[PDB]
Write an enzyme that holds these catalytic residues in place. Sequence first.
Site, PDB file in Angstrom:
ATOM      1  N   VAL A   1       0.812  -1.223   0.000  1.00 29.65           N
ATOM      2  CA  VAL A   1       0.000   0.000   0.000  1.00 29.65           C
ATOM      3  C   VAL A   1       0.847   1.275   0.000  1.00 29.65           C
ATOM      4  CG1 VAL A   1      -1.822   1.257   1.216  1.00 29.65           C
ATOM      5  CG2 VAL A   1      -1.843  -1.256   1.176  1.00 29.65           C
ATOM      6  N   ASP A   2       1.870   1.334   0.839  1.00 29.10           N
ATOM      7  CA  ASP A   2       2.833   2.442   0.883  1.00 29.10           C
ATOM      8  C   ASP A   2       3.795   2.546  -0.299  1.00 29.10           C
ATOM      9  OD1 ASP A   2       1.538   3.275   3.094  1.00 29.10           O
ATOM     10  OD2 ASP A   2       3.107   2.748   4.531  1.00 29.10           O
ATOM     11  N   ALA A   3       3.763   1.671  -1.295  1.00 27.63           N
ATOM     12  CA  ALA A   3       4.768   1.776  -2.347  1.00 27.63           C
ATOM     13  C   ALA A   3       4.613   3.067  -3.152  1.00 27.63           C
ATOM     14  CB  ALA A   3       4.688   0.561  -3.273  1.00 27.63           C
TER      15      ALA A   3
END
Lengths: 77, 57
Positions: A58-60
């Site tokens: 999700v944080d990529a």
Amino acid sequence: NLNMDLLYMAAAVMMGLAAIGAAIGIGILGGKFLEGAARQPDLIPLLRTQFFIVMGLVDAIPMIAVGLGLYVMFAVA
Amino acid sequence: GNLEYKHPYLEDRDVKRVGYLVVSTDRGLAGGLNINLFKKLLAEMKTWTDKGVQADL
């Protein structure tokens, strides 16, 4: 001159929209963990492992938007 | 399963009072049926009553 006016604003839109997507995506993904921790205690450490696997994906794209807004702000302007 | 919710009958409990449902005849002449059941009940009932655990019938 005209350069810093627009280049702050461009970083501001980049790290502002990244601040939407990483907060909403970890809010939805984290609340489903917490019903699973409430529903199945004894599995918190196993579910927490799965939550950290999924949270890295999700944080990529939001972390590339942060890193290039830090670049535009403190490198390009 | 580990998916159990909370529910009195399913989950255990620390024991102080125990209940027995005893089935028995309306009629005599059955011979040594009833009393050979009832002495086994009373042996168990006495066993709990030994430690002071209450009982009910």
